[PDB]
Amino acid sequence: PPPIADEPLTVNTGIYLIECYSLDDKAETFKVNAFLSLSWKDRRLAFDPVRSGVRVKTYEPEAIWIPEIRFVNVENARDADVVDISVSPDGTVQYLERFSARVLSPLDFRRYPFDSQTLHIYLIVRSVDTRNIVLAVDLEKVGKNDDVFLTGWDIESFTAVVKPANFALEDRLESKLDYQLRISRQYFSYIPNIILPMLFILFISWTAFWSTSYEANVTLVVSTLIAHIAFNILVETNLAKTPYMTYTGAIIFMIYLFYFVAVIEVTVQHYLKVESQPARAASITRASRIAFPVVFLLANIILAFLFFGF
Amino acid sequence: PPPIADEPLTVNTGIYLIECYSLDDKAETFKVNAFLSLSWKDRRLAFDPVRSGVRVKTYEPEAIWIPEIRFVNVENARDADVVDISVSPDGTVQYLERFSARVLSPLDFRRYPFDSQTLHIYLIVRSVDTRNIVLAVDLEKVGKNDDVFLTGWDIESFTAVVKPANFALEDRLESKLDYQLRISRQYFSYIPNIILPMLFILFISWTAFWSTSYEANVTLVVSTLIAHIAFNILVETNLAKTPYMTYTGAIIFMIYLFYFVAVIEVTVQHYLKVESQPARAASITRASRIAFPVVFLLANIILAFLFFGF
Amino acid sequence: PPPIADEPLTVNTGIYLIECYSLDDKAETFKVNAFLSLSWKDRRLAFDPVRSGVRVKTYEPEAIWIPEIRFVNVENARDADVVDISVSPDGTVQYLERFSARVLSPLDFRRYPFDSQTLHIYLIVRSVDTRNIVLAVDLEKVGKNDDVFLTGWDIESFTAVVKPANFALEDRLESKLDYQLRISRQYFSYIPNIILPMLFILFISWTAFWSTSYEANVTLVVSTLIAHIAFNILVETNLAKTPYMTYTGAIIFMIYLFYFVAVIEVTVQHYLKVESQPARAASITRASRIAFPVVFLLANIILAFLFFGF
Amino acid sequence: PPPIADEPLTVNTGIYLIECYSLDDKAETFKVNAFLSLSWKDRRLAFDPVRSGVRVKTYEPEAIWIPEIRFVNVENARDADVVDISVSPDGTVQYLERFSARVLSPLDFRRYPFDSQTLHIYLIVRSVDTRNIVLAVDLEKVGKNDDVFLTGWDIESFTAVVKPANFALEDRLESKLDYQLRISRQYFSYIPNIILPMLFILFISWTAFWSTSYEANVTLVVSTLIAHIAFNILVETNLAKTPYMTYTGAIIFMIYLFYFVAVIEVTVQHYLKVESQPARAASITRASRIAFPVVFLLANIILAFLFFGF
Amino acid sequence: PPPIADEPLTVNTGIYLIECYSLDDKAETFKVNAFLSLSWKDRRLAFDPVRSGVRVKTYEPEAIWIPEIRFVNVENARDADVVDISVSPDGTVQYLERFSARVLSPLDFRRYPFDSQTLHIYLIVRSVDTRNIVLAVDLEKVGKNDDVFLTGWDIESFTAVVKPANFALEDRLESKLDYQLRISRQYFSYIPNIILPMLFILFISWTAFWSTSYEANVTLVVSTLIAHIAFNILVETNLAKTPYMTYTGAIIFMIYLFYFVAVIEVTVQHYLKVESQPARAASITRASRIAFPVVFLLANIILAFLFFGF
Q1: Partner A, chain B 52-71, Cβ-Cβ below 8 Å
Q2: Contact: E222, A226; criterion CB under 8 Å
Q3: What spans does the record annotate as topological domain Cytoplasmic, numbered to this chain (chains A, B, C, D, E)?
Q4: C-alpha dihedral, A162 to A166 to A167 to A171, nearest 10°
Q5: CA-to-CA distance for B58 and C244, rounded, in angstroms?
Q6: Do C215 and D216 touch (CB under 8 A)?
Q7: C232 vs D193: CB contact, 8 Å cut-off?
Q8: A267 and B201 in contact by Cβ < 8 A?
Q9: E8-37 burial string, b = 16+ CB within 10 Å, else e?
Q10: Diameter of chain A by CA atoms?
Q11: Of A145, C150, D82, E207, which one has the fewest beta carbons inside 10 Å?
Q12: How far is B86 from chain C (nearest CA, A)?
């Protein structure tokens, strides 16, 4: 029994985030526990203030006609509990539920260690014999609480795109809204556990540029290559199979080349010295001591600029 | 109370994919959130346009007789919410739910890094005292949305096999349809994380073909063999126990042989040189420098052609 | 309201497997999605063909008395949806649900890489004031579909033990049936990923029988021992803590001994040669080159026969 | 509507284990699927055999007043299905459900490889205006079935503490029972996968007591230390963070010391021999060959006795 | 139908913890199973002791008006079962449910191995046409049981902040309470499995300060660096991505520097000795034997004080 009306019915939405948690980088999903605030005019049950009852009349969801508001980018059916329905004397309904769903929003990993994200929450409503249009009442839109806790993320701002996008879908039009949660990753943990350890073993790796023993250099450069494969796997594990190149995935692949040409050096250093050309051997080795660090710091500047500076 | 009819009743199906996600390569399952569109003629409740009501009459699932449409290759009971039922004046019912199930479709891993898949969604319906036949209404079949996001996969096309397959099952006939989602894997992530790293350590592995120290060569060839076992496990983990040979599983097993005959070489190089036959030692070693790379690039051409080119 | 009868009521069961999946070797459980077919005579609602209605009368589960059929070796309550109830004119009820439960069937890992299993599905029914006995109707027992897909397993045959086992349990008798799914493991994946890699590193391990350098031999035999611990863990992970000895668990423990006596050799080879007895040193070492491979191939024949040939 | 009585009402409990599974050592929880048998006298509905009906009258849970029996040490709400309610003519009710919950019982890991456990199942009932007391009817208490399968555990005995413990809790008294499942761990799997492999690498570790090469000894003692860290982690993973010392955790920490003083030896052996005191070097080394094995076998006897023998 | 009142209604809360478990350090969540005790005066149903019935009248949740008490920092909807409702003659309602939810409370990992935590449980209630205020009845607040078992944690005290915090939220005021569970981590497990093993491999690492062989020192210092990366990962795994520095994360990063300057030493020791300056070589090496242990024990005192002593 939809409210008889002369033109499209406006449903007034508003989300109040109470809890955020479990941002799954692999799955590209997060979990929200918030308030949903719906309000529409249904003159069909305007009541008479003085003639009976009180200021506002409370109802159960069964009596009133309620607009079916579905979340779009959500895995299962939104898990909600009705908190209060309050009809105003003019026939204005005040709906308020508390829902908990896990939302499916894509993430951009192009700068995975240092990146910002804009999570999306989408609300749609379908029509029957009257048209429905959703819109945000900003006073119920202040989704954030001063206690929102998203582990490993900094919460910038929860806002809503005021203008809905109205599709036509299966000989009926629907109205979609875009609630946007903007977050930036807390990169600090990565430095003392990934970045700095990865560099250290790379620096050790070419300590063999001040050595002449092949056995001790192959032990050196190779054992550090193993340690880098460990970090490479440790990072590739908590990250989805992106079709592009991540920032750490670039530098982690760059490092792979510095272990190859280092292995190439100590090998070339060896055949050369064993072939009675040590004048060339100790000449190459000495250059490496400058070339490898410089090209590295150079390529990183090239790489870093190619991602962040552009 | 099934609709009394003169011949088999046609139910007109149509799926509209809203979300795709969680393609589990190990489990061989994906998760879909879509629209189901059913439509059948039930003249038993044709209504009179002018005489009463309006153009279209809305019902609750309890009143009308609804065809029981079950998904075949699905784990648990399909999780659906009814969106709208709309009976046309001639007695045509327009059913529309929004379901979310996880579907069980086999995958072909013969070319695991670079492969295409055709996922299946099957709909069946059973008969009672009249026969039922399903068929697709292509206007409700445009399953795709311009936002379908399947991580690590490119979505080619969602179509439906228009001709149903009608089995006889337990003294009653059923009608089955085949909705087909065609996808191709986003292989790019595999190159800088598996393929290229795997090759590098293999090339380093036979840098010992330019060396004479057994100790430094056994350190070399063996330490790289360990690193390959790591990658071998890393790949065997995100992949089911296929009864055939995967493409990477072939090349990853081929690599295992190149580490064996390399270990064989440095060993043969050593007994030989220690046995006062260095004329043969440095002769073998020099050939290896050409044989191993050539046979590898050859075997890969042989292997690659044996999988993709045929 | 159980059907008044003169003697024990026979309920006629029948399972039709639609999907099989998720055989958890660690948990010793699998997941089935099948049809349950129950049929019993309840003369208490025999209806009159000509006098009224039609050939067969359809009911809702609430009206009719339905026998409570419970699955025995199942974790939670079987998750079923009723498909159709059809009472025959003589008072014969045709019940048909579609259930999905995860079943708990023990597995025998004595030949873990190459083994066959017989999964069990048990149905019980309890009595009230009349006795109930279950029995299989073979035309509804053809559980298999030509699409049953059990990853990493070959499905041999789904049959049912026709004779029920009738216990007495808590001053009431119950009737139990045994549906049996016979499967054999798809061993092919194990060879290029476990068996063959494990052997290779073992053969490399005693390439040190053609060498005299202690440093290069301890690097050899020990580094391969590490790689074997990796495979040992990799296999012990996807396998339950059986109280017996598995086939691979035997050969994987046998391999552990060949790494010990090899380490013993190179060590004995060394003290000996360092003690100015190289006549004995190079004598032992040369025998190893034959003893180790022969004893291995011998012990495997002994072991293999002890498991499969007996 | 509780049964009006003159004194505390006795509810007669009884559990019949049908399935046991999923004993999580990390979580300290197991999962049970059993029968619950309740029986109490409610004279308020004692009925007339001859005057009407039959021997026993069957009811639905809604009609009768049922005692609210809650499980104590259980995570979520016990998941039960009612099997039969049968009121005896005197007003004696025979209740029988089939439940499936996961129970939270602490475990004692003091002898983790070889240990016995007593799992607990607790039933409580709260009072209203009459007092309730639970008690076991041993004829319904034979919880075990000849098919109970607890992977990696031997089931000794399922019994019940007949005398309930009656607390006062929030101005109302409750009655608690103690059902006890006694189990002993199947230790066999641990020997060929943890214990024996751990010892082997320790014995190899001090094969360097028959060697003079520092490079080959540091390769020896250290590479085996790495393998022990692997086993140390492999065991610490499937085990909770106990506040006491486990048996394997003791011997695994003892082994850590034997790798330290071994590294200390080869180091002391070296400075000494390099310092032109080989008379002392080869004297220490020779003693190690006896000291380390003896102290080990001694400390193990000391340790083993300190845990099991006391 | 809220109770008509002259001023804000006081609801009297009280939590009785029955089970605590599953404190997820990664997720920063724990799981509680407790009693909720609500009590408010609803004179609108005061009954007449003498005139009818008995001392206390028992109701079903449907009849009475019940205050909607929601948990704040909880993932999904609190899972509760009503135990008893008992209205007093003056119109005082005694509500008691048993709930089980998983709570989301932030943890402070600044001293991760040795740390104390204060878990939070928050209760809110919203107003309608009368105001509601929650407050604790300490006789129902004794949340603890003498059986509360939180694995790997010591439970200090469960208390409640008696003064509620009353926000205004969306043109309606809410009343929030703070129940506080104070716990301290059981650090003992960490010493024999992380701390002591980590130190041992570090001490072994600079046993190369009593050695002159580069090959044996690079084997030494590097192989132990690998073992430390293992522990570093083993610890970083069971710990969230904090934006600050943990205590073990500091010392584990400090250790990384001691492996770098040690690798720097043996390298400098080598170029020097190879450059015919052994007078400086054996001079540096001898100082290291004192510098490294002292600076370590010093830096730890500095670090430890910087975290705990301040």
Answers
A1: 54-56, 58
A2: no
A3: 210-212, 275-277
A4: 150
A5: 65
A6: yes
A7: yes
A8: no
A9: ebbbbbbbbbbbbbbbebebbbbbbbbbbb
A10: 113
A11: D82
A12: 25
Helix or strand holding residue E171 (H, E): none
**Residue D72 sits at the chain E interface (C-beta within 8 Å):** yes
3-state secondary structure of E159: strand
CB B208 within 8 A of CB B221: yes
Residue E165 contacts by C-beta under 8 Å, 6 or more apart in sequence? E175, E176, E177, E178
The number of C-beta contacts closer than 8 angstroms across D and E is 120
How many Cβ atoms from other residues are within 10 Å of residue C248's Cβ?
22
Q: Residue D129 is nearest to which of E54, E207, E211, comparing CB atoms?
A: E54
Q: Which residue of C has its CA nearest to B27?
A: C22
What CA–CA distances, in Å, run from A15 to D233, E73, E75? 46, 17, 17
Resolution in A: 3.3
**Are C86 and C60 spatial neighbours (Cβ–Cβ below 8 Å)?**
no
C residues 152-171 near D, CB within 8 Å? 169-171
Residues 280-309 of B with CB under 8 A from A: none
Nearest to A223 among E76, E226, E242 (CB): E226
Query: From the list C76, C215, C260, which residue is nearest D200 (CB)?
Result: C260
B185's CB contacts (< 8 A; 6+ apart) are B113, B114, B115, B116, B117, B152, B153, B154
**Helical H runs in A172-213?**
190, 196-205
Q: Which method, experimentally, gave rise to this model?
A: X-ray
Residue D89, SS3?
coil
Report how far residue E297's alpha carbon sits from residue D192's, in angstroms, rounded to the nearest whole number.
41
Could you check whether C1-189 and C190-310 share the same CATH topology?
no
Which overall architecture, per CATH, does domain E190-310 show? Up-down Bundle (1.20)
Phi/psi of residue D135, nearest 5 degrees? -160, 155
CB A181 within 8 A of CB A121: yes
Separation of alpha carbons E153 and E189, rounded Å: 11
Q: Which helix (H) or strand (E) holds D121?
A: strand D116-126
For chain D, the structural domain boundaries read: 1-189, 190-310
Chains sharing 3 or more CB pairs under 8 A with chain D: C, E
The sign of the torsion formed by the CA atoms of B141, B146, B151, B156 equals positive
In whole angstroms, what is the distance from residue C66 CA to residue B297 CA? 69
What would the CATH number be for the domain defined by E1-189?
2.70.170.10
Distance (Å) from the alpha carbon of D156 to chain C's nearest alpha carbon: 16
Tell me, yes or no, if B237 comes closer than 8 A to chain C by beta carbon. no
* Helix H or strand E segment including C199: helix C196-205
Residue that has been written with the tokens 């109970």 in this structure? D148
CB of B31 within 8 Å of a chain A CB? The answer is yes
Are E140 and E37 a contacting pair, CB within 8 Å?
Answer: yes
